[PDB]
């Protein structure tokens, strides 16, 4: 039988009997109200259940129903536009069906609707008797205008097709494929189920190559991320985190977005769930909602602690499911510190040894196993394809102390740090990225991509980072030397560093021409700024030895029009100017500055 009975209750811990043959970390339903919990010990016919919800009013001799599964996700059509908690409860259906502002104890709405009918097309050259393997696409559901929801055979399933449905409209409970292996059948609907803590398998796991574009000049130029990459951001109040989330959501070369709240303040979660449905992007010359390619996992700080800890495992398992369709998925975790605190509470409730700063002994192993699921892959199964998951994960060091075990482990693992900074945000400098602390390690991997597609960019990035370092090195010296007595080469460095800092690194995302700065615009601007730097340096160095030498004042007096045209480059607009027009204008400034410097040489 699937029923055992409650022997004893003490806090969230339930102990149940007749539980013989129940398995470690299975989920159960406890009591007449069917509270969820998981099995944490076995002893004889008894089990100990860690109940997730409130055990108040549970009684001895209550039923316990065993579910044959560990913690697992329903994966199938109806994920796009969904709101889930950390254990996949559909928060927007629970509200609609209950007509209540609360979440009931023991609510049991299924994660995906078994009510809606989905428009299904088979693979058209599959036939009865075909040989089929895990990851094989056997149909498509036309879920919305953006996502073809590819129906795939589960991993660990295989055989000979005994039946496949004709085209039509089906429930998530209708069997659409049947197959046989060793004379044993399997019947399959559109929805599969997968354990959150098991990595979804792939044919091969591949080096990351192509950039993830954000549309931001800083980020995309100075500190690039690859598709399949791993990134951290400092998650703190004044720093302006929303530019990352909105750039990824609206403008990135992702196909799909997964957003995870780990344990946020009630009112902070409400702003994300307010703003995300209202965002839009333009596709084939038509405006589309962001929620056609997006799903949200949401957890306020009073949701069950097991949901707070499961939250990132639900979000990555949902991401790995769309990777397997051959899409590129971006994942955002709202703070991984709020997850590590739930991990500390659970291990504290279990009375585990307090290791480092009260965190469990496995904290670093859990974070390494999480970020290890990022990457480009060659998918399982027959239609040859590649996909990827990229992780961005915020982290919240106490008072900026990076020696914190969670922050230290995170920055020990991730390959990019986008150091958003309150001290820059207070200057109205946007985006707030600290270009002295921020870094990317993917530059040896991206080399052969830039080399092929842009070619001149790698030298330009190198000189730009040097100018932005020399202007830090000069920042003390200028206070002693009094600006005027400085070398003309170094006055050129200071005031081209000002040009880069004010007109290249700043990008006002509310202005129509700079919402999204494409990479040809981004290299075009930097090419001209560094060309002017080289020419200004050459004009001084040609004459400084004994002539009536060139000075940075002479250059500003002789070329102030060109120096204004350079500050004017950011206003060029891909909505109204063609790529060829922007290229022609930036080439014309390069002719004009050559004619101006040749009139001084």
């Amino acid at each position: 039988s699937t029923f055992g009975y409650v022997h004893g209750v003490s806090g969230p811990v339930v102990t149940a009997c007749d539980m013989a043959g129940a398995a470690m970390y299975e989920l159960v339903r406890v009591g007449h109200s069917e509270l969820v919990g998981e099995i944490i010990r076995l002893e004889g016919d008894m089990a100990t259940i860690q109940v997730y919800e409130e055990t108040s009013g549970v009684s001895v001799g209550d039923p316990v129903l065993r579910t044959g599964k560990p913690l697992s996700v329903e994966l199938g059509p109806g994920i796009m536009g969904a709101i889930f908690d950390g254990i996949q409860r559909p928060l927007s259906d629970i509200s609609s069906q209950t007509q209540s502002i609360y979440i009931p104890r023991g609510v049991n709405v299924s994660a995906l609707s078994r009510d809606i009918k989905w428009e299904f097309i088979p693979s058209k050259n599959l036939r009865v008797g075909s040989h089929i393997t895990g990851g094989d696409i056997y149909g498509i559901v036309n879920e919305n205008s953006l996502i073809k929801h590819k129906i795939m055979l589960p991993p660990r399933s295989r055989g000979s097709v005994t039946y496949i449905a004709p085209p039509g409209n089906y429930d998530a409970s209708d069997v659409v494929l049947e197959l046989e292996f060793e004379g044993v059948k399997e019947k399959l609907s559109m929805v599969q189920v997968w354990p959150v803590r098991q990595v979804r398998p792939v044919t091969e796991k591949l080096p990351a190559n192509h950039p993830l574009l954000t549309g931001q000049r800083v980020l995309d130029a100075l500190f690039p991320c690859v598709q399949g990459g791993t990134t951290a951001i400092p998650g703190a109040f004044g720093c302006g985190k929303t530019v990352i989330s909105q750039s990824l959501s609206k403008y990135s070369n992702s196909d799909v977005i997964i957003y995870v709240g780990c344990g946020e303040r009630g009112n902070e979660m409400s702003e994300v769930l307010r703003d995300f449905p209202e965002l839009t992007m333009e596709v084939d010359g038509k405006v589309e909602s962001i929620m056609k390619r997006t799903a949200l996992v949401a957890n306020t700080s009073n949701m069950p602690v097991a949901a707070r800890e499961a939250s990132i495992y639900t979000g990555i398992t949902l991401s790995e499911y769309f990777r397997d369709m051959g899409y590129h998925v971006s994942m955002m975790a709202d703070s991984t510190s709020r997850w590590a605190e739930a991990l500390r509470e659970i291990s504290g409730r279990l009375a585990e040894m307090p290791a480092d700063s009260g965190y469990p002994a496995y904290l670093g192993a859990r974070l390494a196993s999480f970020y290890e699921r990022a990457g480009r892959v060659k998918c399982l199964g027959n239609p040859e394809r590649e996909g990827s998951v990229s992780i961005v994960g915020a982290v919240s060091p106490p008072g900026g102390d990076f020696s914190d075990p969670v922050t230290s482990a995170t920055l020990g693992i991730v390959q990019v740090f986008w150091g958003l900074d309150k001290k820059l945000a207070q200057r109205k400098h946007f985006p707030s990225v600290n270009w002295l602390i921020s870094y990317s390690k993917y530059m040896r991997a991206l080399d052969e991509y830039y080399d092929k597609h842009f070619t001149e960019f790698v030298p330009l990035r190198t000189k730009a980072k040097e100018i932005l370092q020399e202007e830090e090195d000069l920042a003390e010296i200028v206070q002693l030397v009094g600006k005027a007595s400085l070398a003309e080469t170094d006055k050129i460095t200071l005031e081209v560093a000002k040009l880069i800092k004010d007109d290249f690194l700043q990008q006002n995302g509310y202005t129509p021409y700079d919402r999204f700065c494409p990479f040809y615009k981004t290299v075009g601007m930097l090419s001209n700024m560094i060309s002017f730097y080289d020419m200004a340096r050459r004009a001084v160095e040609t004459t400084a030895q004994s002539d009536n030498k060139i000075t940075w004042s002479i250059i500003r007096e002789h070329m102030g029009e060109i120096l204004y045209k350079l500050s004017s480059m950011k206003f060029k607009d891909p909505v109204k100017d063609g790529e060829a027009k922007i290229k022609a204008d930036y080439a014309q400034l390069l002719e004009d500055m050559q004619n101006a410097f040749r009139s001084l040489e």
Binding site: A20, G21, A22, Y25, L42, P70, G364, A368, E372, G412
Partner: protein, 457 residues
């Protein structure tokens, strides 16, 4: 003789908690025996007997306890402790952290089955290591010389180039060929690719054995991974007479897995929550190195460490330095200055250097030049620390000599680039050139008979 009597199988699992499964009604339990578990879904897992008492045996399961149950799970007891099949075919193979192949080749045909735990070598039968290896890295060869048969770990931290240094050492090691046995615990796929790529790019791969446990693989494999690797090095060295270099990649992943295992048994904690016996445990790995009487072969160990928050007083680098014959120290402050290799000589040591160098071994000056370079570098650091308080105008010309030596030492002696392969003699003469800056009466580690022979060149 062979185990000719048949194996017992049991459904008598009486309880499950943490990584531990507890059988009862077991016929004459054997401590440290291996057990094979078949789960209800037909998945196989393995575990080892961690305790016995009457009819009960306690098993730790290497792949974890998730999905095990008290009724359908079945355990087969092998009659024996953990042994690994070993042959000279294992060079040019890739294995996972439990010794199963991952290169699409076959399983090993054993030349023998060896106990994974090894066996302590008698101190009477040890030969003291005295043949210097030239790594060609000047910061190692000139100031921390490595004898063939030493234990000398690389103490590093997250983001530093300890992979690249360890690859350069494997690429350049020779006497003034090695077989390589390489173990990885808890590595990311880009680290696993880097080594496998470099060994194939240098053509060396037909003479390398790899054991890989990656960051997503089971944690409890990590505590047998270095014992599989060192058992392979002991066959190759002490039966097939080869010279073996053993690389153990991130021992901090081994120590973290050991803490996680021990925390579940509630054994007495030491500092920072590590097991009270961690010194002994690490010593059973690091003492599996050296030369022995009457056999040509040798094992050299170069374990790689990540220091948590760069703290050398943390139990992992601390208890390792108490056992190993020195350390090479990779410094974040040199790495941030774009120097390669980032080897800061002051926290670094080699103990076996003292007898592997000098007349007949290398050159007569080597023991004097090395000690004077340490003295001038320590004093140069003290003057640079004084300058930060009082400013340059306070410094006497004698302070400015040490502060000029400091700049030239880090550019000429330390900095090298990834494929440069200096002789010991280049390293020694690059040594004398920096020492030549100082008027000879300042060179107070060096006796008159050395100064009057080598300084005037």
């Amino acid at each position: 003789n062979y185990l000719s009597q048949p194996r017992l199988t049991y459904k008598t699992v009486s309880g499950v908690n943490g990584p531990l499964v507890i059988l009862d009604h077991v016929k004459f339990p054997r401590y440290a025996e291996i057990v094979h578990l078949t789960l209800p879904d037909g998945t196989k897992r393995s575990g080892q007997v961690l305790e016995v008492s009457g009819s009960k045996a306690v098993v730790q399961v290497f792949e974890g306890t998730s999905g095990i149950d008290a009724k359908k799970t079945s355990c087969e007891f092998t009659g024996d402790i953990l042994r690994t099949p070993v042959s000279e075919d294992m060079l040019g193979r890739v294995f996972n952290g439990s010794g199963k192949p991952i290169d699409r080749g076959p399983v090993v045909l054993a030349e023998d089955f060896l106990d994974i735990m090894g066996q302590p070598i008698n101190p009477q039968c040890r030969i003291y290591p005295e043949e210097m290896i030239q790594t060609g890295i000047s910061a190692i060869d000139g100031m921390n010389s490595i004898a063939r048969g030493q234990k000398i770990p690389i103490f590093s931290a997250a983001g530093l180039p300890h992979n690249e240094i360890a690859a350069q050492i494997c690429r350049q090691a020779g006497l003034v060929n090695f077989a390589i046995v390489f173990a990885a615990m808890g590595v990311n796929m880009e680290t696993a690719r880097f080594f496998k790529s470099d060994f194939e790019e240098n053509g060396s791969m037909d003479n390398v054995c790899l054991f890989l446990n990656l960051a997503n693989d089971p944690t409890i494999e990590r505590i047998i991974t270095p014992r599989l690797a060192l058992t392979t090095a002991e066959f190759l060295a002490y039966q097939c007479e080869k010279h073996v270099l053993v690389i153990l990649t991130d021992m901090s992943s081994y120590a973290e897995a050991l803490r996680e295992v021990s925390a579940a048994r509630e054994e007495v904690p030491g500092r920072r929550g590590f097991p009270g016996y961690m010194y002994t445990d690490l010593a059973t790995i690091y003492e599996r190195a050296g030369r022995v009487e009457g056999r040509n072969g040798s094992i050299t160990q170069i374990p790689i460490l990540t220091m948590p928050n760069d703290d050398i007083t943390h139990p992992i680098p601390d208890l390792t330095g108490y056992i190993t014959e020195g350390q090479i120290y990779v410094d974040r402050q040199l790495h941030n200055r774009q120097i390669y290799p980032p080897i800061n000589v002051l926290p670094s040591l080699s103990r076996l250097m003292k007898s592997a160098i000098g007349e007949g071994m290398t050159r007569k000056d080597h023991a004097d030049v090395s000690n004077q370079l340490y003295a001038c570098y320590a004093i140069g650091k003290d003057v640079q620390a004084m300058k930060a308080v009082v400013g340059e105008e306070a410094l006497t010309s004698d302070d400015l000599l040490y502060l000029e030596f400091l700049q030239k030492f880090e550019k000429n002696f330390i900095t090298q680039g990834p494929y440069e392969n200096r002789t010991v003699y280049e390293t020694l003469d690059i040594g004398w050139q920096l020492l030549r800056i100082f008027p000879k009466e300042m060179l107070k580690r060096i006796p008159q008979s050395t100064l009057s022979e080598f300084y005037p060149r």
